[PDB]
Subunit: 141 residues, 4 copies
C-alpha cells in the first residue's frame, strides 16, 4: 500500500514484555524506534540477533529504542527460548492484528525504522548486520 511510505505516521500496536505487562509502540513516541520482528523458529531472524544487540549496546543512552518483537503464534515457546538464550535488550512479543493488516508483516525477518515524530523512516528497514544501518540510524537521531 501507501500508508507505509516514509513520512507516513507509524501505526501503533501492542506488545507484551516477559513479565506480562502490555506496552504500546506509541509509548516510545519521541524516540527513534528500530524494530526487529523475529520468531523462535526463524533461523535467519536469530542470525541477526547479535547485530541487533550490538547496535543496542552502541546506542545505549541515545534517544533510540531497539525493540525485539517476537511474532510467535503463542507466548510459551518465546519464554522458553529466552530462558535458554540470554539477551540484553528488553524483549517483547506481539500477535496484534495491526502487524499483518497495517504494517503488512507478511514475512520475517522484517525490520522497521520510525523517527522521533513517530513517522515511518523505512517500513522495510535494512537488517541490523547491514553496512548502512548505523549511518541510517545516525541520520534520524
Amino acid at each position: 500500500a501507501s500508508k507505509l511510505l516514509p513520512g507516513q505516521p507509524a501505526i501503533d500496536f501492542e506488545m507484551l514484555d516477559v513479565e506480562g505487562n502490555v506496552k504500546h509502540l506509541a509509548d516510545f513516541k519521541g524516540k527513534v524506534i528500530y524494530i526487529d520482528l523475529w520468531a523462535t523458529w526463524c533461523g535467519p531472524c536469530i542470525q541477526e540477533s547479535p547485530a541487533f544487540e550490538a547496535l543496542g549496546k552502541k546506542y545505549v543512552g541515545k534517544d533510540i529504542v531497539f525493540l525485539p518483537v517476537s511474532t510467535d503464534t503463542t507466548t510459551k515457546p518465546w519464554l522458553r527460548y529466552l530462558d535458554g538464550h540470554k539477551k540484553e535488550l528488553t524483549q517483547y512479543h506481539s500477535n496484534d492484528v495491526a502487524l499483518k493488516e497495517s504494517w503488512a508483516i507478511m514475512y520475517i525477518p522484517r525490520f522497521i525504522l520510525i523517527d522521533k515524530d513517530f513517522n515511518i523512516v523505512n517500513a522495510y528497514a535494512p537488517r541490523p548486520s547491514s553496512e548502512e544501518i548505523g549511518t541510517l540510524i545516525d541520520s534520524v537521531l
Copy 2:
C-alpha cells in the same frame, strides 16, 4: 543427538496434502527423499522455493521425491498462500510432534535428505540453491 547421524534410519512422520489426505514419510520408502521444511511467513524459506521447484523439474521421473512440507501452526494460512502462489510440486503440511522431537526441527529453513533404504544421508542437508546439492543428489540416486 546421534539418531540423526548419516546412515541412521529416517524417522517417519505424517503429513497432509491440500486435499486433506494423510500421508506418511515412509510411503516414499524406496525413493530418495529431499524435504523442504518451510512456512508461509518465513521469507528466507520462500526464497529457496524456485530452486526446490527447479530441482523437482530436473529430476522428474527419477527415483526421487521432493517434499515441500509446511510447518505453519495452522492449515489455513498454508492453503491461502498456495491459493495465490502456484507451485508445481505436490504440497504437504505437518505439525507432527516427531518433527520437533525426533528430527530436532528447531529452526527453518531446514532441509533433509534420505536415501532409498530410508536412511539419513544428511539431516541438515544443503539448501536447494547451493552449488553442491545436485552432485549430492546424484551421488545417492
Copy 3:
C-alpha cells in the same frame, strides 16, 4: 558519507559491454536505473540473479533500465562465466575507481536505485528478491 543521501545527484561511472563498448551510467539519464553489482565468485550475488532477471522481464518496455555490473578484478572470468550461463539482460562490467571512492562500494551484493532525474533513490537499495522492491520501483516510475 552524505553525497549518497536520497535526492543527491547520482555519480557517473563507466562500464564495458561484452562487445567492449564503453558506456556511461549517465547514458541512461531519464530512465529509472536499478544496478546489480555482482562478481562471478560471489555466491550470494548470483543467488539474486533470477530475481533481477525476472524484474527486468516484468518491467520490459517501461522507462527503467536494469544494469547488471560485474566488479570482477579482470574481464576474462566475467566473459567465461557469461559463456556458460545465459542471461537475458545486457551485461556490463566495471572497475571504475568511482565505484569504490564515490559510491562507497566496499561489499557486494550491492544494489543501487536512481530516479529519472538521475538522483539517488537509495544508494543501498533492497535486493531484487525482496518483497518491497517492486513497490519501490513502481513509486519512482
Copy 4:
C-alpha cells in the same frame, strides 16, 4: 567431481600469513581443519566472521585449527582490511591454483572441514553460524 567425496584425501595448498611466511595446509595434518574462504569485498563472507571467531574461541586448545583464508586477488586490500578490523584468529591468504582446480572453489562463502587423518569430512561444509556445525565438529574431534 569425486576427488571431493568425504573420505578422500584433502588437497594441499599454500597460504601466506600477515608476516609473509608461506604455510601449507598439510602443516596442520593431525588436527581437524575447518577452513573459511572469504574475501574483503564479500559481504556475506564477513557476516560469518563472528561465528567463525566464536567457534575458534570455544575450541581453543582442542586438536582443531580454524583457518580464515582470504582469496582476494591481491594481498594489499587484505592487509588494509585487517588493519581496520581486529580479529583473534591467525589470518591467512591464498591464490593457490589448487583452490580453483582441485577444491573447485568457484564461489564464496565456502567452508571446508577436514579430519585428523587429513581426509575430507565435508568439502562444502556448513557455515559457522549454522545450528549443526558444533555437532559436526565434535563428531570428528
